[PDB]
Design a protein around this nucleic acid. Structure first.
Ligand SMILES: [Zn+2]
Ligand SMILES: [Zn+2]
Ligand SMILES: [Zn+2]
Ligand SMILES: [Zn+2]
Lengths: 193, 182, 182, 193
DNA sequence: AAACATGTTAAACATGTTT
DNA sequence: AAACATGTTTAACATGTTT
């Protein structure tokens, strides 16, 4: 069952979240809590930062997995309802079963591991734009973290991993993901807890 | 409106559409599913171009771009295929290509046509509008309307349909109130 | 409502019924006893068909099936006579037959009519509703109403009655609150 | 982050606002609230009064700065929209980025601090006209106090400072500035609050 | 049935524009 | 000035779940 410990690796790999506006309540992040609260199917900008240029076909794989020990062995797919619902799939090219999607990147390739059957999504690594210090990747989470027949409100967490073009892990960072309806409210309540 | 040889047509099933007002009310940067329907297979490369333009005769000659604020605000731009100036964007299609006319300077976005899915009866396109219908320094609340055109791989027009677009914050409210004027 | 020649009628004695709201509030997959009463013996094969349909004019044309989750979730399906797609089920009757209309695609369930028990005054049918009135990908909280129809063995209608169905989790609460709106 | 406390200084430095007509609703002042309510790009007359002639190159610098602690460190510039909009900049000589402008004075010089990057505008001090008790300076505020991509309705306040020709502060006065569309209405509502 | 978790639906408000 | 148009801010409401 895939590792979830932070491992900076030779390229000082790192992921962070910086707010796209100046509200914009579509999502929010508890650096303190290592939790990302965000709305379903909406877009989440995630900042990647290295300290030294990674290898060649270097890729960034984002994989979802249940937080709690009891479920870790269960794959994380979209609930039956959404995996068919006309919406979010109609003009889509991405596997309707996959939870995690990346928008704005034709090269993005979705993958199901033949043995573990674990779904994940990869994007070829490209350095930041000139004058920019972050490579930004656009993720989309396709099921509330409470879809019955899916996560059924079981905490999950994302494992973004920087890997060599032939799957060797060069770096890994994790954060708990909780896709809902009122990221604002929920984060707030979660913090008063 | 020009149905053309393939009896080209657009229709709609965070946004809403007044059939009889030929007006689309939708929130900014939110996704707009749009239905395309032909009667006979179009040529081969056949593309679907979506172009914005001002409704009022006063302003038709002025190109339609995103207001300066949005145009250069990391937000929505940062990790993006499309140019930050373009108002119309299409999501869910790597083949989608954005184009600026060298002479007219007009911005538009094309997407290669493809028959519907088996059993289906519509070629559905995903459009995103990236500036409110009121951005100062942009549309400055000047009504605009979208011109979706089915064209031949080399730019020959095969059909054209058009509806008024009004991307705001309360498409519901606005639509309703806009329905009160009668 | 069409009483018909046999003065056909439906009535009610985990669920509850607002007589004056013609609304049935009941929990999912729980059992609903429904009372049938005629005035004169119906024909011979005479059947009682229960069909679901959306109350709102907007959606009447759309068939009513179980949401995808329930439709294919071993739970409630595994060992079952009836099709997993069908919303309405009848328990306690081997003769009960489920039917999908080839043309309209509409789902429904029939049960052969039988006079009441001796001394009794009602033909009681046992209905099960298999999806909440709010299942995403199904009724998506769109009010539906049941159409129980007494028909002739060959499908001729002899009578029809109808009540609004709202299968939820707290029929008590919902009913009460739904009674507060007045 | 620039000081905002009133400091009369050796020359009994003072700023006040006296109404140019006898309506004229282009602006208004709540002496009581220390708030100036005024329309964008329109002209605001501000009265300067000393008690003893200031030094030589003595200047009057007006600098904008956010009121609330959370933003004080952020410079105050014109929102992107106005910094390009053909209007208000076409026949203008002043930096389209600058919020505060002074009209009716060729010697007025706009300045961006190389280190802090803070924009301000200076005007050489000149005593009142004969028989007059005030040196009047004409300011123009170039962005609503709600321009998105700019102040985004964040309260700001002006810091007019009397300084020696080589930047030594001889006096300073502050007032909250809220440039809007209906100074009348807004002030009224603000007072019923 | 109580206290709670969480998606759905919108109202009250702030503030520029039109009349 | 009074009304109108519109983005924003915040809340209430509906309903399955948990206790
Ligand atoms: Zn789901
Ligand atoms: Zn804009
Ligand atoms: Zn269901
Ligand atoms: Zn501005």
């Amino acid at each position: 069952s895939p590792s979830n410990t932070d491992y900076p690796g030779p390229h000082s790999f790192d992921v962070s979240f910086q707010q796209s506006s100046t509200k914009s309540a579509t999502w929010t992040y508890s650096t303190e809590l290592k939790k990302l609260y965000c709305q379903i199917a909406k877009t989440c900008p995630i900042q990647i930062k290295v300290m030294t240029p990674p290898p060649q076909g270097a890729v960034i794989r984002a994989m979802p997995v249940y937080k709690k020990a009891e479920h870790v062995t269960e794959v994380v797919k979209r609930c039956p309802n959404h995996e068919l619902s006309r919406e979010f799939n109609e003009g889509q090219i991405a596997p309707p079963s996959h939870l995690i999607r990346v928008e704005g990147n034709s090269h993005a390739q979705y993958v199901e591991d033949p043995i573990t059957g674990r779904q994940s999504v990869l994007v070829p690594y490209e350095p930041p734009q000139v004058g920019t210090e972050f490579t930004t990747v656009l993720y989309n989470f396709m099921c509330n973290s409470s879809c019955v027949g899916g996560m059924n409100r079981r905490p999950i967490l994302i494992i973004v991993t920087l890997e060599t073009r032939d799957g060797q892990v060069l770096g890994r960072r994790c954060f708990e993901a909780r896709i809902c309806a009122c990221p604002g409210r929920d984060r707030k309540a979660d913090e008063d807890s």
